[PDB]
Amino acid sequence: SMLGADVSLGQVVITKNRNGLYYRCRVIGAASQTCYEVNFDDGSYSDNLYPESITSRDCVQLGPPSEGELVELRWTDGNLYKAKFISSVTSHIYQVEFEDGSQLTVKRGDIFTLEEELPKRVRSRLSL
Numbered sequence: 001s002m003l004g005a006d007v008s009l010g011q012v013v014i015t016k017n018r019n020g021l022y023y024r025c026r027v028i029g030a031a032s033q034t035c036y037e038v039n040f041d042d043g044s045y046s047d048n049l050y051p052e053s054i055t056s057r058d059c060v061q062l063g064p065p066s067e068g069e070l071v072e073l074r075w076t077d078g079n080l081y082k083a084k085f086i087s088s089v090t091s092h093i094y095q096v097e098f099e100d101g102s103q104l105t106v107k108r109g110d111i112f113t114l115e116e117e118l119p120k121r122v123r124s125r126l127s128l
């Protein structure tokens, strides 16, 4: 959910447009994305796991497993795998609209509020 979000609908923020420059833009949409982090038995991981993929527990109804809990999941190949549940992360993603009417979906980490100190790499590419 949007619980704990530090950016409001209608807020003016700064972000990179695909043309390479940084511009002021307005927030027109907001959403949350919940992903699980799991460690596979082969030494690899996923930090993008759909909570609905876990088959040893109904995570949509009951919430996430305990941290460190051993789980079973169904991967995108349709097969079942064992993994260790590490943690759940809910992040906020925003849709912005530029002066020219173009739009872009941006993660919170790629947005700069107007109070934040901008890096030298951002002020040199900033359009007024």
Ligand SMILES: [N+]
Pocket (backbone or CB within 6 Å): 006, 007, 008, 113
């Ligand atoms: N903010």
